[PDB]
Amino acid sequence: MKEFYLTVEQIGDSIFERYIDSNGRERTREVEYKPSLFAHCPESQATKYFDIYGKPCTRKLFANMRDASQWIKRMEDIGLEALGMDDFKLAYLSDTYNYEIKYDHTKIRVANFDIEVTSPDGFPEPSQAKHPIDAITHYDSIDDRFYVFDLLNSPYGNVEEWSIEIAAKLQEQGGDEVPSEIIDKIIYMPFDNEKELLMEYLNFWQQKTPVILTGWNVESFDIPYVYNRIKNIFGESTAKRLSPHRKTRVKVIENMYGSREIITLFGISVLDYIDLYKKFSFTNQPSYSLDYISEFELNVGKLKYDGPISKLRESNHQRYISYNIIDVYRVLQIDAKRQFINLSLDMGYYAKIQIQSVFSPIKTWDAIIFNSLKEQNKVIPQGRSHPVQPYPGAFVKEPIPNRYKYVMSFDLTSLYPSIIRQVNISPETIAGTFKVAPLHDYINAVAERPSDVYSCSPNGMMYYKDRDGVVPTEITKVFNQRKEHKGYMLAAQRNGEIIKEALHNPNLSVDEPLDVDYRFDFSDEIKEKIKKLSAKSLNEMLFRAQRTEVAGMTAQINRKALINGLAGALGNVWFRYYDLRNATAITTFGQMALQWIERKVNEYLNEVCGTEGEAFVLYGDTDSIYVSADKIIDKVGESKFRDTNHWVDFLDKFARERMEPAIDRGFREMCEYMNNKQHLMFMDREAIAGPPLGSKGIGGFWTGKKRYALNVWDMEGTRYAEPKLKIMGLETQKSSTPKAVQKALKECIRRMLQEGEESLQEYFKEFEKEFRQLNYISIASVSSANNIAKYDVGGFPGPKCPFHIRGILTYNRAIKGNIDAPQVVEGEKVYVLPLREGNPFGDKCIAWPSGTEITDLIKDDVLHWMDYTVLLEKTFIKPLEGFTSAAKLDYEKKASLFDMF
DNA sequence: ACAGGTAAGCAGTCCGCG
DNA sequence: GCGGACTGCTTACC
Numbered sequence: 001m002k003e004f005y006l007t008v009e010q011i012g013d014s015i016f017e018r019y020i021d022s023n024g025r026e027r028t029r030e031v032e033y034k035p036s037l038f039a040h041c042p043e044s045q046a047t048k049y050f051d052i053y054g055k056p057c058t059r060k061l062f063a064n065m066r067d068a069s070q071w072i073k074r075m076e077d078i079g080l081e082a083l084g085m086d087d088f089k090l091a092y093l094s095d096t097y098n099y100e101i102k103y104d105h106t107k108i109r110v111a112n113f114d115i116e117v118t119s120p121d122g123f124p125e126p127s128q129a130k131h132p133i134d135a136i137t138h139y140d141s142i143d144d145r146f147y148v149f150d151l152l153n154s155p156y157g158n159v160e161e162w163s164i165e166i167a168a169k170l171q172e173q174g175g176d177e178v179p180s181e182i183i184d185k186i187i188y189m190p191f192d193n194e195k196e197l198l199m200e201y202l203n204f205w206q207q208k209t210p211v212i213l214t215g216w217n218v219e220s221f222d223i224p225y226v227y228n229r230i231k232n233i234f235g236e237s238t239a240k241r242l243s244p245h246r247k248t249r250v251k252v253i254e255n256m257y258g259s260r261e262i263i264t265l266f267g268i269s270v271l272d273y274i275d276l277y278k279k280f281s282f283t284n285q286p287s288y289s290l291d292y293i294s295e296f297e298l299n300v301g302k303l304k305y306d307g308p309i310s311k312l313r314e315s316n317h318q319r320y321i322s323y324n325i326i327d328v329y330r331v332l333q334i335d336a337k338r339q340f341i342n343l344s345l346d347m348g349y350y351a352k353i354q355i356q357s358v359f360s361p362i363k364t365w366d367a368i369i370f371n372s373l374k375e376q377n378k379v380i381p382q383g384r385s386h387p388v389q390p391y392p393g394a395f396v397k398e399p400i401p402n403r404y405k406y407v408m409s410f411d412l413t414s415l416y417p418s419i420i421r422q423v424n425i426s427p428e429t430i431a432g433t434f435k436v437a438p439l440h441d442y443i444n445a446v447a448e449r450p451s452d453v454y455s456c457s458p459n460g461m462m463y464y465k466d467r468d469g470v471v472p473t474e475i476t477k478v479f480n481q482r483k484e485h486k487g488y489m490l491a492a493q494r495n496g497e498i499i500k501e502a503l504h505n506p507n508l509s510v511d512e513p514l515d516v517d518y519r520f521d522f523s524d525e526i527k528e529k530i531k532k533l534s535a536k537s538l539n540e541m542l543f544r545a546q547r548t549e550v551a552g553m554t555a556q557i558n559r560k561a562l563i564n565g566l567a568g569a570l571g572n573v574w575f576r577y578y579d580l581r582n583a584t585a586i587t588t589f590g591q592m593a594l595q596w597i598e599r600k601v602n603e604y605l606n607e608v609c610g611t612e613g614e615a616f617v618l619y620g621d622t623d624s625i626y627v628s629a630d631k632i633i634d635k636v637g638e639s640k641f642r643d644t645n646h647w648v649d650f651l652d653k654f655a656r657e658r659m660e661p662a663i664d665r666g667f668r669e670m671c672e673y674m675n676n677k678q679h680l681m682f683m684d685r686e687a688i689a690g691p692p693l694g695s696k697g698i699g700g701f702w703t704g705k706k707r708y709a710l711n712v713w714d715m716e717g718t719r720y721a722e723p724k725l726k727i728m729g730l731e732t733q734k735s736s737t738p739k740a741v742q743k744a745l746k747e748c749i750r751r752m753l754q755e756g757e758e759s760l761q762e763y764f765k766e767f768e769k770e771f772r773q774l775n776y777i778s779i780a781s782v783s784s785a786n787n788i789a790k791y792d793v794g795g796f797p798g799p800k801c802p803f804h805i806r807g808i809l810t811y812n813r814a815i816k817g818n819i820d821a822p823q824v825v826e827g828e829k830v831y832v833l834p835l836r837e838g839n840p841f842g843d844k845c846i847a848w849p850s851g852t853e854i855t856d857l858i859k860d861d862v863l864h865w866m867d868y869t870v871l872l873e874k875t876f877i878k879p880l881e882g883f884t885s886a887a888k889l890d891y892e893k894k895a896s897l898f899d900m901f
Numbered sequence: 902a903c904a905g906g907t908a909a910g911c912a913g914t915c916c917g918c919g
Numbered sequence: 920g921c922g923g924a925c926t927g928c929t930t931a932c933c
């Protein structure tokens with residue numbers, strides 16, 4: 001089989017690499033790598049190395065890696081460009097793997113792990129590691145085994161072995177309910193003492209050394225804690241065994257509130273799942289406890305126990321171990337759904353970087369572009385330094401706040417990358433400039449055609465049409481992968497809607513779910529086979545379909561993220577190819593494109609309706625238009641259609657047959673006008689939106705930019721079983737609005753768009769009446785805890801102190817003394833509650849770490865002195881007023897004037 | 902340091918206001 | 920005694 005790397009590191013003048021050989025065997029080697037850089041030389045001097053502009057370079061081989069760096073320095077000490085890949089790991093990878101890497105994941109050792117530390121001192125600090133490690137569950141992807149290391153004796157109690165027979169049993173039967181499918185995969189190891197526990201774990205680490213190291217919060221807690229515990233006990237030399245090469249960097253970086261520490265383990269690629277999740281999940285969560293994320297992701301419960309966690313090992317060691325095992329499995333369950341490790345392997349190898357570098361779009365693209373260039377014997381430029389300059393981005397239309405009954409939207413496919421490809425924007429495709437008319441002259445086709453020779457952006461830049469450019473070339477590739485997985489995604493979604501429809505005719509029948517690939521539109525026979533199936537079998541299929549979709553979502557949205565990131569990278573001063581000329585060429589062309597088609601789309605319909613100079617496009621952001629479809633519908637009359645589904649099927653056909661071809665012609669012209677390389681501005685219909693037929697519903701509304709709600713029947717060719725609410729920017733979407741309140745505002749909106757005003761009033765009446773009975777956690781606000789210190793000033797609110805920061809201050813003050821209550825972690829999320837007039841906290845609000853319940857030390861005073869009125873007013877009524885005003889409705893019954901009857 | 906800009910709403914502070 | 924203008928902060932939308 002083809003060879004592939006596991007990990008690479010540079011230590012002094014040597015490169016350390018773990019890899020899989022041509023026989024599937026894991027090997028390590030240290031290489032005295034001889035790097036090669038480049039300097040400009042005279043035109044006459046004939047070589048085969050040219051920089052990106054076509055200027056000739058000379059290659060310089062260095063005896064060791066230090067020599068190469070010293071030269072770079074000496075060249076800056078002179079003032080001449082020092083060219084080539086300065087990060088030697090990437091050049092080594094590029095040299096050692098001159099082909100497209102096809103890896104075998106079953107050969108890659110991914111370790112998933114978690115530890116427990118009993119601590120009656122408050123949170124056990126990794127930097128200090130004062131308390132014993134008393135459990136380690138470590139899953140190995142190669143062995144398919146959960147390795148459990150369990151301490152029975154410690155300063156904080158002595159405990160009987162864990163029982164796997166009990167662990168397996170129901171909660172409802174006094175067991176722990178550890179899943180069947182992993183019961184047989186547990187390797188249990190009791191330990192007399194911590195010394196042996198740790199000593200054994202290290203020898204285990206040696207024989208099954210992780211390549212990919214993951215888990216929950218593993219980089220802020222488990223890794224640092226185990227490193228430091230071993231360091232405190234056996235010395236830093238032993239602790240260094242956690243690195244296959246024995247080298248570790250310790251980034252001290254503290255804060256005002258003590259000492260936090262991050263350890264780098266050379267030879268291992270650490271991918272903390274919380275960071276994977278934050279980067280790839282595209283959620284903004286109110287809390288990042290595993291319980292919370294497990295629940296959100298897998299719809300599994302809370303992992304319940306009695307008393308605090310600090311007292312769990314002693315009171316119930318049985319459950320203490322099972323819960324540690326389950327925590328590890330949970331991350332695995334999340335990864336089987338989200339596929340983030342898989343994604344990271346794909347990108348890492350695609351680009352030829354350290355896998356952990358996937359967190360860096362700049363590092364990722366530098367390498368892709370580097371390798372691409374290396375293939376044509378071209379030489380990359382030196383990374384220079386620049387001042388940060390702001391630059392303009394997208395255009396957003398200011399909309400008329402209002403209800404809108406029938407709405408149809410249209411969106412451009414991968415716009416910024418498409419613009420890159422259409423215009424041919426790349427560091428070496430720059431041809432010159434032209435003098436720019438103000439933007440609106442390009443929008444309305446008044447300004448003279450900028451060039452007859454080059455491809456142009458309304459920002460005044462001109463690019464060669466004939467050549468290629470690495471950026472377009474490399475961007476097009478990742479785009480095509482994007483399009484592939486999007487395709488799989490949408491079809492899985494389409495299929496999922498068909499299963500939903502079928503769940504109205506569930507057959508009284510005993511069968512198994514169909515063996516089908518959900519990435520592809522179901523065939524007629526499969527469809528025919530589906531109606532006759534049972535509920536039990538249909539639901540299994542639905543679940544699978546969704547699972548396919550999530551998988552496809554992950555692959556698609558994150559390639560999109562990466563390609564959009566190149567476009568922004570052009571405007572990050574650390575990117576090798578930083579260049580505001582190019583970044584600005586992207587954004588400005590975007591602004592023109594959007595407004596150009598707004599002109600065209602208003603023009604077309606005004607002709608097609610005979611009407612004169614009416615507005616149809618009511619909104620647009622960046623690359624989207626929202627078209628007011630009322631006149632098209634009225635041209636036929638709501639009298640007809642019989643059902644909702646008729647007029648949707650109408651509008652759809654009108655979009656695909658009439659609008660798009662006009663839209664296409666519009667973008668053809670603009671491409672011509674701009675004289676671009678290839679037309680790639682593709683705008684197809686997205687959402688079809690309105691109320692159920694002849695209902696009291698308003699269909700949709702806007703409040704301003706970035707804030708609207710629509711009742712969507714069809715989205716990108718997916719016809720929903722039930723109409724789905726598209727809500728953008730409103731409080732229902734924000735992680736800072738109380739859960740109960742999101743839910744209720746969503747129903748108010750649902751009731752606004754699907755049913756009428758009465759329905760909405762009826763609900764508002766109910767909600768307010770019932771509000772005081774909801775759980776405190778459900779009605780609490782959420783916020784991040786940035787810059788606590790800055791505003792601290794004696795433990796009381798400093799100047800211009802933010803509302804939430806104030807609330808933490810009241811917390812801290814109220815938990816003074818008993819270091820036992822959890823401390824608000826700086827930069828983490830908190831619940832916030834307003835405090836009622838004249839309370840014992842001596843301030844007007846309180847905050848505490850999210851996920852958690854507040855410690856009982858203050859819980860009951862918080863519940864009593866709770867300010868429901870200010871909560872209701874601020875978080876619910878206020879935003880509702882916003883929605884209904886814009887919608888021209890009232891949430892409360894108005895004074896009839898007739899009431900005197 | 903190690904993708905980008907655009908933009909909304911909520912509070913705090915300071916000022917004008919018979 | 921409070922509303923408006925401005926700014927800090929937070930979290931959305933592309």
Ligand SMILES: Cc1cn([C@H]2C[C@H](O)[C@@H](COP(=O)(O)OP(=O)(O)OP(=O)(O)O)O2)c(=O)[nH]c1=O
Pocket residue numbers: 411412413414415416417560561564568622623905933
């Ligand atoms: C979502 C997003 C968009 N954008 C910019 C670049 C996008 O080309 C443009 C429009 O964004 P989107 O409409 O969200 O998506 P897209 O055009 O990139 O791709 P698609 O429509 O197929 O999903 O806005 C970013 O710069 N960063 C981002 O994270």
Ligand SMILES: [Ca+2]
Pocket residue numbers: 115116324327
């Ligand atoms: Ca734990």
Ligand SMILES: [Ca+2]
Pocket residue numbers: 411412413684686716
């Ligand atoms: Ca689309």
Ligand SMILES: [Ca+2]
Pocket residue numbers: 411412413414415623
């Ligand atoms: Ca788009």
Ligand SMILES: [Ca+2]
Pocket residue numbers: 411621623624
């Ligand atoms: Ca869009």
Ligand SMILES: [Cl-]
Pocket residue numbers: 127128129227228229231232
């Ligand atoms: Cl230590």
